[PDB]
Write the structure tokens for this entry.
Amino acid sequence: ATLHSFVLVDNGGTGNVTVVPVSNANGVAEWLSNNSRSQAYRVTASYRASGADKRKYTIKLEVPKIVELPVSAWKAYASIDLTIPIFAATDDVTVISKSLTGLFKVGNPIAEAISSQSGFYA
Amino acid sequence: ATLHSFVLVDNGGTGNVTVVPVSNANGVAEWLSNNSRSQAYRVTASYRASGADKRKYTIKLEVPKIVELPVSAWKAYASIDLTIPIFAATDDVTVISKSLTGLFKVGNPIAEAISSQSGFYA
């Protein structure tokens, strides 16, 4: 099942965040941490076709900060649109995922930049 | 230096993909694999202010899959927009990354969905 509960944040066992499936309504897949709107981790995902030869994916993530904001959004917002051409059932496309996870890997440039409130400097 | 070479694809030593900073054209960052246009792994990144109290990140990725298309290609295209408000120097926001990786961690609903050329079903 593609729609199943998963650890979104892995702190190594203690302080893990689990998002559970709460909807699959007319296209949109929705995951949600067991919190109140304001404090909940969110994941939304759709899957459609882009023109003739490709498939499109629209993912959205909302992560709250620990620490004006009754129900107000002191959340970080992410939006991903991955457009991949249709491939034969025998092909291996694990690549894109490993590249995505490679982007946000801790100790990597971009991962490091998001943490310093910094840009990309030489 | 945020503009520093990194491993985007980690295959456990043999067949890793290193991306090197090639430009920083007065804004956008750009990492490329030592390959000809057609076959290279590509990364880009902007960093700008979104209104009064937040900042935005604009990341795009091109994942060539060795799989008509000479210069045109079986490229997987990703595009991330990450809106994050202003946070104190002392603050820990590493949860953003941890979340980003979670989402694309292999063995997870999403990594699993982009493989089978599937959507979110039960």
Q: What stands out?
A: Chain B has one domain: 1-122. Chain B is about 10% helix and 40% strand.
